[PDB]
């Protein structure tokens, strides 16, 4: 989705 729910955590910090 457009909420950075596809990262390596839950803060849009460290997304692949």
Q: Is the dihedral of CA 6, 9, 13, 16 positive or negative?
A: negative
Return the residue matching tokens 């990262």.
7
DSSP classification of residue 1? -
Which residues, other chains included, contact 8 with Cβ-Cβ below 8 Å and sequence gap of 6+? 14, 15, 16
Q: How far apart are CA 16 and CA 3, in angstroms?
A: 15
């Amino acid at each position: 989705n457009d909420d950075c729910e596809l990262c390596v955590n839950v803060a849009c910090t460290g997304c692949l």
